[PDB]
Design a protein around this motif. Structure first.
Motif, PDB file in Angstrom:
ATOM      1  N   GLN A 136     -28.080  -4.090  13.293  1.00 28.99           N
ATOM      2  CA  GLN A 136     -26.964  -3.551  12.549  1.00 28.99           C
ATOM      3  C   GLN A 136     -25.835  -3.046  13.477  1.00 28.99           C
ATOM      4  O   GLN A 136     -24.682  -3.447  13.306  1.00 28.99           O
ATOM      5  CB  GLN A 136     -27.496  -2.488  11.579  1.00 28.99           C
ATOM      6  CG  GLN A 136     -26.755  -2.364  10.270  1.00 28.99           C
ATOM      7  CD  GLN A 136     -26.858  -3.567   9.346  1.00 28.99           C
ATOM      8  OE1 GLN A 136     -27.835  -4.331   9.355  1.00 28.99           O
ATOM      9  NE2 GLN A 136     -25.824  -3.738   8.529  1.00 28.99           N
TER      10      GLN A 136
ATOM     11  N   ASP B  43     -24.266   6.057   7.570  1.00 27.93           N
ATOM     12  CA  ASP B  43     -24.698   4.969   6.716  1.00 27.93           C
ATOM     13  C   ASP B  43     -26.097   5.289   6.193  1.00 27.93           C
ATOM     14  O   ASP B  43     -26.433   4.930   5.060  1.00 27.93           O
ATOM     15  CB  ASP B  43     -24.659   3.639   7.480  1.00 27.93           C
ATOM     16  CG  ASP B  43     -23.392   3.480   8.305  1.00 27.93           C
ATOM     17  OD1 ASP B  43     -23.202   4.296   9.240  1.00 27.93           O
ATOM     18  OD2 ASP B  43     -22.579   2.564   8.031  1.00 27.93           O
TER      19      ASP B  43
ATOM     20  N   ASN C 208     -28.641  -4.888   5.636  1.00 26.17           N
ATOM     21  CA  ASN C 208     -27.987  -3.598   5.598  1.00 26.17           C
ATOM     22  C   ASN C 208     -28.648  -2.691   4.564  1.00 26.17           C
ATOM     23  O   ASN C 208     -28.730  -1.491   4.762  1.00 26.17           O
ATOM     24  CB  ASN C 208     -26.481  -3.769   5.344  1.00 26.17           C
ATOM     25  CG  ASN C 208     -25.735  -2.444   5.259  1.00 26.17           C
ATOM     26  OD1 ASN C 208     -25.362  -2.011   4.173  1.00 26.17           O
ATOM     27  ND2 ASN C 208     -25.510  -1.802   6.403  1.00 26.17           N
TER      28      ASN C 208
ATOM     29  N   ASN D  42     -30.980   0.693   5.894  1.00 27.56           N
ATOM     30  CA  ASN D  42     -30.248   1.844   5.466  1.00 27.56           C
ATOM     31  C   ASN D  42     -31.117   2.685   4.549  1.00 27.56           C
ATOM     32  O   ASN D  42     -30.786   3.813   4.235  1.00 27.56           O
ATOM     33  CB  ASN D  42     -29.107   1.304   4.629  1.00 27.56           C
ATOM     34  CG  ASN D  42     -27.764   1.605   5.197  1.00 27.56           C
ATOM     35  OD1 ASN D  42     -26.886   2.020   4.460  1.00 27.56           O
ATOM     36  ND2 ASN D  42     -27.562   1.346   6.491  1.00 27.56           N
TER      37      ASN D  42
END
Lengths: 285, 285, 285, 285
Positions: free
Chosen positions: A11, A145, C233, C237
């Motif tokens: 990421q 995030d 993501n 996350n």
């Protein structure tokens, strides 16, 4: 010339390359990855893709060969002692390939830290120094995030953001802001032998988050802090695995102690103004 | 129960084991070595010899199996960045083998040091901290034996010790004493999670060394401070290896800048009375 | 007469041994594992447990000694190219030990596949062919349990199953079913020199899964197909570690491309009627 | 830049190197061999010689360090299962060393073959596919000199070529020509990710070989086709050890089933017209 990025399909790594191709032609970026085919989309853009594996020293020489600037991103593993051996081998391989600049992603205010992971990064920074290669220590804050994302929808309907972070202050920044920081350092002069603590100078709390959540949504959300056990239980009850929940409970517990409570202008001096927490709430809904 | 000693065929390691035997039966001492035949003399005294090479992680797994206390003597290699890989291997293996207490020979006042090797010692300390194994950082001074040896005979009738150490102060202690400190720590209670800066609280100068030489020997010997490229001459132009002559010249240079000028009582509180410089000058002649 | 099973502590391996125990005396089953102490419960029940590490030809010479039939469960490693080296070692050791029948867990419809892992399985199947040992290629589907597991509570709560699988068809079957097939082949005749594509003949899609999860739970759940990047993501996350989020997303990416969309009767013909999707969901709750 | 050739001391690799010298400077050629001194003659020519041994991964890491193009010549052993292990090690060291292009000598129309070695080559092709290195599969025909050699004197003396090849057609090619193909592929662009089936477009039969042998020798020679079991017995009685008797008989048997009867223009398009069978016969005697 040549800039290399390890953890490239990670990421942070991916974002650095995206930011990097704003400043340099893709033919100048090298993506270092342990399974090359999963970086095919970057190969498509003209970024050279190389096999590199922190766990296999025999792989690194060819990964680092001919590179001018290396972005060395710390390994995701959570065996700390193992991480040391991996990083030490990365550093040795960077030395032997004759790399000219090493940028390393470490930990903010690591000398003051209450967490064994800080010692990993400290050890690595010292490893990088023995090398004599000009360096930049990019000591990244926790990612925002991580707390500001999809999952806050639960909190909207639940009415609560549950954590075990107490009244802890958080100096987190977005992964994207950190990536831009890295990219900037790799593409402009004057960052040789510099240690940056890259954190927010406009910190927040989870009561704040609850409050901003209430405003930008419309339903009231409070922050209900709890114990380490109760929070590990909360996430388990809702389908998150136990190791993953130890990690998230780990992060919060740390937050409650002051671990994310020190600030610096380092990041702002580097990339300009930071994204406000509210805007990051919006860019999540 | 068992105490192991890496580097056990080197000068320090050898002396540690001698001190160790005054305190505990030989069957309780494991000697770890690169060459297992080149230590038969240790096996005769009833000391368990095992093979361990810092470049071989698997050799160390076996070497460390079952040890209670480990004296991790720092590696001798000249490549600092290599040394970090090696040290990280050693640290991982001790963690894996379940070592109950780990002592490490580091470097006195390393944070203020201007010598590259210091970064190695600091990285290794952080790697050890990582394992959470109770530790004793034995931060050793420079060896007195380094300056006071066979080579003073060669200065004597010549009439001059020639160094680039300027007027700097030296806090060196003998290998023997540091070995005693090491052995003392492995051997009594109360040294867990401690950092000791093991230097002399009676420092001396190179001018003083000259005086003590005259005092003991034949005639007038003086100190003769030289440049540090001018020093390479009275060394490389007399039959001495060019990496080794560099190593020495960069020590003297550090000494001329106060590297060895600070002191501590740590050693004396640990072992008692220190050996007077004059004693060691006689002994090396 | 002996039947040995590699990966006997893994999830497939364990269930195979359960099934073998229902068909033969324990004294005829041999478990091969990396960590024999952890498999001690098999030994308590009379199953000899032998040490086997794929990187270790010597470990395998002893694991395979005197075994009649070997179930060679494929390696878990992520390094496909190392995986070939490991599998080659297994094969050569099985050959050298005079194993009389080899069953190997491969990859369904591998010749058609768009995934490097398929090349590992085809290479392995050829390696086995070189030995002349009668063989059974148990070409296993993805495990239903990878997608249908109590982790689905997250989706129950949030009202969505978020994948990057799009409308790809999934021919998965349960671990138990494959284990049963493995055990059936080892304990009955007529499977020598056979290749089986052990997949469902009643496949499903994530839209269907979301509809079943609705009916079963009571709550409304939809399927939410996103991009590859979006999924990575999303997981990273939400606490999922990056190497594991990469594996899930790759699996999902494969499915969207029709990697799991071909069906066969092989499994049903071997073990009888298959467990419906609805049932595994109830079962996961 | 550089091109390395394994088996550089065997017949095929030696030939390749002579060809490659017509094309590139000798400094640009690395010869990888089991015994370095046994290759002094190549050293003399100005060719860099490196130790490499398919059983020793470590040797291959150092041997392949920095090479751009590697010609990987298959192992000469007749133990197919050992070949797989040996080959897998080559593939991994090439992968690890970041070889930029890998050409492998396999076997023409391998998927249609019934002879054992074909499985080895298939397995190696799949191994190479996993590395993601641009490849060239040089799928060689059976060697013409396997049939057309000094041993043909036996048949002149005896009056007969005895095979179990019946009326099978033979598409074999001399090693020299296959070597020229390899050299060509390695010194020109456009062969990345290609599979060439490199056979003759002027095939022949044993009856014809017999008749050519009569023209050249001046003595009548006939093909005498016999059964598999008679060929084995014939050969063993000529002194050929039974393992090599099997291999030969199985080759001929395969020829009699059409195995060497399909042709392709790949070779001709790569190197020009082929050496007439008659020239090879004259040269062999």
């Amino acid at each position: 010339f040549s800039i290399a990025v390890t953890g490239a399909t990670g990421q942070l790594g991916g974002l650095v390359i995206q930011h990097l191709m704003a400043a340099v032609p893709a033919s100048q970026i090298i993506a270092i990855v342990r399974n090359v085919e999963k970086a095919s989309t970057l190969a498509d853009q003209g970024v050279e893709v190389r096999h590199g594996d922190y766990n296999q020293p025999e792989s690194l020489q060819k990964a680092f060969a001919g590179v001018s600037k290396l972005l060395f991103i710390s390994g995701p593993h959570y065996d700390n002692t193992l991480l040391i051996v991996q990083h030490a081998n990365v550093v040795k391989a960077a030395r032997d390939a004759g790399v000219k600049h090493i940028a390393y992603t470490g930990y903010a205010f690591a000398e003051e830290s209450i967490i064994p992971l800080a010692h990993v990064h400290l050890a690595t920074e010292y490893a990088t120094r023995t090398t004599n290669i000009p360096y930049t220590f990019l000591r990244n804050a926790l990612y925002t995030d991580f707390f500001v994302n999809e999952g806050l929808r639960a909190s909207t309907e639940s009415g609560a953001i549950v954590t075990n972070a107490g009244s802890g202050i958080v100096n987190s920044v977005t992964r994207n802001e950190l990536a831009l920081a890295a990219a900037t350092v790799l593409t402009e002069e004057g960052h040789e032998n510099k240690t940056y603590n890259l954190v927010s100078n406009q910190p927040w709390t989870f009561d704040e988050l609850a409050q901003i959540l209430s405003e930008v949504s419309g339903k009231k959300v409070v922050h209900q802090p709890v114990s380490f056990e109760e929070e590990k239980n909360f996430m388990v009850n809702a389908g998150v695995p136990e190791p993953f929940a130890e990690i998230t409970a780990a992060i919060y517990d740390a937050i409650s102690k002051g671990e994310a409570s020190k600030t610096s202008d380092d990041l702002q001096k580097l990339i300009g103004s930071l994204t406000p927490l509210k805007e990051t709430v919006k860019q999540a809904l």
